[PDB]
Write a protein that binds this ligand. Structure first.
Ligand SMILES: C[n+]1cn([C@@H]2O[C@H](COP(=O)(O)OP(=O)(O)OP(=O)(O)OC[C@H]3O[C@@H](n4cnc5c(N)ncnc54)[C@H](O)[C@@H]3O)[C@@H](O)[C@H]2O)c2nc(N)[nH]c(=O)c21
Ligand SMILES: Nc1ncnc2c1ncn2[C@@H]1O[C@H](CSCC[C@H](N)C(=O)O)[C@@H](O)[C@H]1O
Length: 261
């Protein structure tokens, strides 16, 4: 019924070539060539990002969508792209990252970009059952794609449900992935959360066309329904007007070393 639900249905109707063409339509992504080469060679002191996540968080941070301050907690940290980005910011005093890191799930990567020493990575952790901890900045980048809109909705509502427990502890800043903001129940939950904690949902330009993911962030306040539909319209336009045109941008390079007393 929602424009996003229509988008999801049409996305699944594309043949293999149509899908490939759509995925490459008017997108922007960082060039990962150097980072991948450095990581494959075991280089840990060149400042490259462990994942594309570093550039995604940088985009939100550099324009005030989320302030990264004090005690940072990263739920579903994976390799740690958000943890390393946060650790390099002067306003951040410490970073605690949690992730599954088992049964195919990405494990934290150990590199020595600026502030690596103030990060505490913990794997074998299901954040849905992790007792909330007090922090100043709450980050969460969880949401597994599914060809089923119903499944994406269920997964998204579960993430928001868990995150609400953490926000209820009192946090100043947050950036939380919302996998399927186009689903009716998710929109309503977001409206309720906004009335309780403020913020709004924003589409990151680095996100792929094949996902409707948006992020619930603390740095702005706007009508959720409007912004989500704005994104649905953009994604539908790209599907109807394929181009396969990709734009590349420089990946993030962080300073290196420890942050000490
Ligand atoms: C591989 N794949 C994924 N999707 C759709 O794209 C979403 C994201 O899949 P991804 O690949 O980008 O993995 P993240 C899936 O949840 C599904 O709806 C596809 N749709 C078509 N029509 N053909 C595909 O081959 C296809
Ligand atoms: N219930 C759960 N508990 C902990 N981690 C989970 C989880 N469900 C998914 N994850 C992890 O959440 C991660 C999402 S991808 C996160 C990428 C990260 N922001 C970066 O910048 O590198 C994946 O590693 C996935 O394994």
């Amino acid at each position: 019924k929602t424009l996003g639900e229509v988008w999801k249905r049409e996305l699944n109707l594309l043949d293999k070539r149509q899908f490939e063409l759509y995925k490459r339509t008017d997108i922007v992504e960082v060039d990962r060539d150097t980072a991948r080469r450095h990581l494959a060679e075991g280089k840990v002191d060149t400042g490259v990002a462990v994942s594309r996540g570093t550039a995604k968080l940088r985009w939100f941070h550099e324009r005030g969508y989320v302030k990264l301050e004090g005690r940072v907690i990263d739920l579903g940290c994976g390799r740690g792209g958000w943890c390393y980005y946060a650790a390099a910011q002067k306003e951040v005093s410490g970073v605690k990252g949690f992730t599954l890191g088992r049964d195919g799930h990405e494990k934290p990567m150990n590199v020595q970009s600026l502030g690596w020493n103030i990060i505490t990575f913990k794997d074998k952790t299901d954040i849905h059952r992790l007792e909330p901890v007090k922090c100043d900045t709450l980050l969460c980048d969880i949401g597994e794609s599914s060809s089923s809109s119903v499944t994406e909705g269920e997964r998204t509502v579960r993430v928001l449900d868990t995150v609400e427990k953490w926000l209820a502890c009192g946090v100043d800043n947050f950036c939380v992935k919302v996998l399927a903001p186009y689903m009716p129940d998710v929109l309503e939950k977001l409206e309720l959360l906004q009335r309780r904690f403020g913020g709004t949902v924003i589409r990151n330009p680095l996100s792929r066309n094949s996902t409707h993911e948006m992020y619930y962030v603390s740095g702005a306040r706007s009508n959720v329904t409007f912004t989500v539909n704005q994104t649905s319209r953009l994604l539908m336009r790209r599907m109807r007007r394929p181009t396969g045109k990709v734009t590349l941008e420089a990946d993030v390079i962080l300073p290196i070393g420890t942050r000490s007393v």
